[PDB]
Design a protein around this nucleic acid. Sequence first.
RNA 1: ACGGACUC
Length: 160
Amino acid sequence: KPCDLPLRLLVPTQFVGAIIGKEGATIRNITKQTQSKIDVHRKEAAEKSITILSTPEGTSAACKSILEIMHKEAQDIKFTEEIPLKILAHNNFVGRLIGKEGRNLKKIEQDTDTKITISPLQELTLYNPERTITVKGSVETCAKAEEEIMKKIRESYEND
RNA sequence: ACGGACUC
């Protein structure tokens, strides 16, 4: 029933302060409301990883809160550039997400109204096996795409 | 730096 595989996001360092909040208040609320364990590295592109461990539903809820917080802060500081959702996933667990001929990926794109691209295999390194899944859309469409992407990642984890 | 946090 529990899947040990966390959701891992890549977010711009600029927005981590809003995610965590003064004295941890914001992230404290998220982890309480979504019953999740969320890890942000203090030192670590000017992007930082966030690891979210929870049920599928609590994981999607925490991701959606982080996307909402980040979009608000971008508006607050007149940050005009798009902020795609970026999911990290081990190379061993992406073939099911993509599917024969990209079929599964394109279906998620059409179902969620996002544009999803995966980093090229040859950008991996010996000791970084994580591909970057970039999801372009609104807060709402990106959150739905996260739900569908991680279903496929977990399906591969739990079988493959 | 709005850096919070629950083990194995």
